[PDB]
Amino acid sequence: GSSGSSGQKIEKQYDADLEQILIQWITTQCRKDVGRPQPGRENFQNWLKDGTVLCELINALYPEGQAPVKKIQASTMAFKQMEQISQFLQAAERYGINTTDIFQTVDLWEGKNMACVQRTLMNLGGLAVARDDGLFSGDPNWFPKKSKESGPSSG
């Protein structure tokens, strides 16, 4: 049901200004060339859909051995790929990001919530740029170096 007078198009939480930056960063973060796909929003989904790439990202950050996803193989298998995505998320949260923002394995694999994952990533970068490890790559401007505040100790 269209709003009517105020609201021509859907108020989706997707942006084409951040997508362009993502592909630019992701491709950078990862040393090797995963295969910088098209800048379109139709491919991006397929890029991470497989899962491989995603791994290259989280793996690019953490140092040798520290990387959460050591095994990285592009298994055409539909069952494999999906699971391949979780391998990243599992560490995505443990890294610092909040599960309340993290997308779902299917949300991306099937591209149901391309708006969610499209953001979940941006957070991965903004957080890294807030660290002092000196691993993060690509222009630090892309993501905000702003600092957030956490609650009370565990409990």
Curated annotation (Swiss-Prot):
Disulfide pattern: none
Ranges of residues in domain Calponin-homology (CH): 16-128
Residue numbers carrying N6-acetyllysine: K9, K12
Keywords from the named record: Acetylation, Isopeptide bond, Methylation, Phosphoprotein, Ubl conjugation
Highest rank taxon of the organism: Eukaryota
Entry comment describing in which tissues the protein is expressed: Expressed in epididymis (at protein level).
Keyword Acetylation: yes
Gene Ontology biological-process annotations: actin filament organization; epithelial cell differentiation
Gene Ontology MF term list: actin filament binding; cadherin binding
A single Gene Ontology CC term: cytosol
Stated family: Belongs to the calponin family.
Protein name: Transgelin-2
Organism of derivation: Homo sapiens (Human)
